[PDB]
Amino acid sequence: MKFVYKEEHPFEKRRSEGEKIRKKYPDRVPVIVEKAPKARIGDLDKKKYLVPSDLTVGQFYFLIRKRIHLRAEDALFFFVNNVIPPTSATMGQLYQEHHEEDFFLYIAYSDESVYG
Template sequence: MSPPYKLEHSFEKRRVEGEKIRRKFPERIPVIIERANKSNIKELEKKKYLVPSELTVRQFSQIIRQRLDLHSDDKLYFFVNGVIPSSSGTMGSLYKEQHEEDSFLFITYSDSNESEKFNAKDLQSK
């Protein structure tokens, strides 16, 4: 498992990049999505996504499901700051409520709906 994005890239580097992305693409949401350590789902090849703000969380979930080659009966849960976001909400509204100071929205995915709060330790290798 690759190291968490926050450990690979300093806050300052993320902040500069996030602000640059938001200036260049104001209608897009910079997302970092990472697998939870306790998850049995494979790791995505790519962690960083730039998604339309009007895309719903459900639609983004479908994109990630395709990238992970999940079957319709396979479970996939998203967590933002330890909470499962509403699937009917837009990525733009989720970003407004939950983005970090570096201008990125961090999402953790798992095959379990455990309500524990995920943090950098949970993303580290077993």
């Protein structure tokens, strides 16, 4: 899954900025959120988020839904490494399990249940 943020910031700068942002906000995880390419769905103004590490995936669904101006009845799926993460997991658990070597967590969102 291609993230534009990776193409526009080289790995080394990403890594040093992730280190800095984990030090400044130790109880928050930094997350990159991008729309999946083929998804017919609202785009998001910002990509970089600081998220409380005890926030659940469901609560993240709620907040992201608020930001793309979706109704609760409209569909919204998250993907971490092309897999839908469990709704009950915390963002801290997701970070520990799936953070990349630049200290960032990468999440894609779509209106479809399969990434593409």
